[PDB]
Subunit: 379 residues, 2 copies
């Protein structure tokens, strides 16, 4: 009887907490965290992370939810344990650090070997099949998370889809828990085998990077041929097989996931003949070179950056010519960024900057649009 289940969350970042609040609406949830201070705020119904819906739900809804720093208390009697501890992939060494996930698997296997673990942390392709065989256990299943930090609970209440990397009754029972707490009805739900589930996000994220890189190359062509990029892009994207989003020219795809995931996938293609996977990584370098070359042809003595991640690679190329960069970014409280000077006064910024670069056009820049370079079209 799923109605009487206990679900434990191990890791209280946005993924763990989102899943915990979602499920606690209808079931008993216990969140384990190593930091006593976070357990205290949670038990006082205060969210330790910035997320509107999570704070609203914890303070205003009757959730059968509590936290603890105690492992035995957290895991015992758990039907499912959702693992959402920190992990990190480093492209330079091709090293994926999964130590927090393996430590949790260790603890649960010792404390409650009957619990079914659902890993939501990001792990390498093949991780789950491998750890099951290494430890001689079977109670571990991977399920990707498609949440955006800052709208994590919102995304679990309105998910694109639910994917559980096991084809069985207990996987179907866990998918039911996720849909029961959701606001969206009829959520597409897919059951796959293990390694296939772990590859979905890399292929999905790499496709998005590909799309951005493609529209960026279309933009490189338009600039070099003196054409209106927006006219071409809008005409192309009115084809419904292509669609009209994720098509805004930029200085390169960036953010915390695409650069790393594209490289992670390329590393997984080590012995698979391919041209597109490798080109998606190379394309971003080529685009930043093009953007930097276009700015440098203007012969600036100083380049100003209006607001602050691909623009960092543009800064790097400019500073390699001995050209200083000044930055205007109020959100930044630092004195410098990658050694370059943050300027608080906006009117001095416009005066000194021979070329102002930005991933978005802006109202205040109108007066100096003649020296503003942005390829943004739809921001």
């Amino acid at each position: 009887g799923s109605e009487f289940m206990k679900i434990t969350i191990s890791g209280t970042g946005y993924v763990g907490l989102s899943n915990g609040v979602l499920i606690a609406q209808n079931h008993e949830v216990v969140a384990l965290d190593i930091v006593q201070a976070k357990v205290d705020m949670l038990n006082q119904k205060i969210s330790p992370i910035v997320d509107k819906e999570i704070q609203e739900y914890l303070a205003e809804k009757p959730l059968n939810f509590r936290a603890t720093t105690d492992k035995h208390d957290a895991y015992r009697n758990a039907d499912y344990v959702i693992i959402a501890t920190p992990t990190d992939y480093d492209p330079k060494t091709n090293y994926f650090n999964t130590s927090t996930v393996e430590a949790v698997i260790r603890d649960v296997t010792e404390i409650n070997p009957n619990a079914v673990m659902i890993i939501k942390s990001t792990i390498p392709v093949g991780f789950t099949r491998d750890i099951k065989e290494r430890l001689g256990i079977d109670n571990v299943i991977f399920s990707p998370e498609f949440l955006r930090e800052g709208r994590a609970l919102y995304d679990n209440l309105h998910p694109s889809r639910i994917v559980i990397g096991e084809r069985s009754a207990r996987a179907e029972r866990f998918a039911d828990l996720l849909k029961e707490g959701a606001i969206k009805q009829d959520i597409p739900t897919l059951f796959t085998d293990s390694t296939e589930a772990e590859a979905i996000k890399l292929f999905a994220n790499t496709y998005l990077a590909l799309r951005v890189a493609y529209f960026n190359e279309l933009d490189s062509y338009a600039e070099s041929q003196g054409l209106n990029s927006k006219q071409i892009i809008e005409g192309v994207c009115l084809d419904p097989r292509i669609g009209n989003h994720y098509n805004n020219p930029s200085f390169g795809y960036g953010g915390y996931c695409l650069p790393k995931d594209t490289k992670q996938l390329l590393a997984n293609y080590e012995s698979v003949p391919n041209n597109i996977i490798a080109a998606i990584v190379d394309a971003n370098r080529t685009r930043k070179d093009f953007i930097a070359d276009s700015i440098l042809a203007r012969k600036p003595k100083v380049v100003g950056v209006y607001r602050l991640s691909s623009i960092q690679g543009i800064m790097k190329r400019i500073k390699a010519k001995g050209i200083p960069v000044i930055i205007y970014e109020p959100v930044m409280q630092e004195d410098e960024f990658f050694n370059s000077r943050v300027v608080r006064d906006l009117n001095a910024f416009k005066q000194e900057a021979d070329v102002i670069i930005s991933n978005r056009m802006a109202e205040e820049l109108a007066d100096v649009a003649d020296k503003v370079y942005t390829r943004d079209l739809f921001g």
Copy 2:
């Protein structure tokens, strides 16, 4: 008064005829063709091409439509002349043959210099701006056609969008004629400058080839890693920013347009730094090598092809090893195809073929599925 206009169509293939029938529903249309026999069937309301809606409209609706082999009769007093004569791009020489279009432009400029010409034939990027300057004329505008042969009138009655490569009142007046005859309401309509309009289809078609090549590389990876490709693809495509069509693995993108358009665009990128555009062309060669290598590892003495265009590149690679290929394709009335033997008997085909390859799985192949190799998932 658009209500009293005359529109002439020069070229009666599916694009010319589709536009002519569409417009003749509300206006006077005259179709010029050089072949007297086609003018006769048209005047007898018989369609010279295979297209259900065109034949239905010509035989059953009261269209103010007639044909003629006479140029003076066709062009005089025309407000617009739609040019839809044959053109062809050859990737090997990078030669785009636009002679039929230039001959029409010549004739109209002589016979009725006030007519506004709308080119619907496919032409090279920059063609219209160039011909206007070369001839010292201004009455030529390009508008892409997004029609599928066989559903050409259907596609003009339900278009994805309308793009006219001129931003002016007379371009808006011509777009109105296309929407007036359409069944679909609210058709997205975009007015661009000339060269931008001519680039839309190359970029759109190349994006589709890119998408097919990407899912094909995902499939290469799945096969080589022993994974279920459908599980990964369905999980990826449930992301609404990616969507779920144009994602069926194959032996390579093919057809009459993608192979040529990808190469045509790559040629246009001669002096523009890029990695994706070039990789889209290379990716197809790499995919066919992978597919052929997978078939050859099975050590077939004879490879059978079940139904018949990327599979042609697979045939080529197989025959290069001295391995004969036999083909089962009823639609083909030829004795051979690229020198290989067409077999009419289906049961002999299954007996001789050590490996049966096909871009689609089939009912009759169930009994020999153990030796059938197709990467199709959604056909």
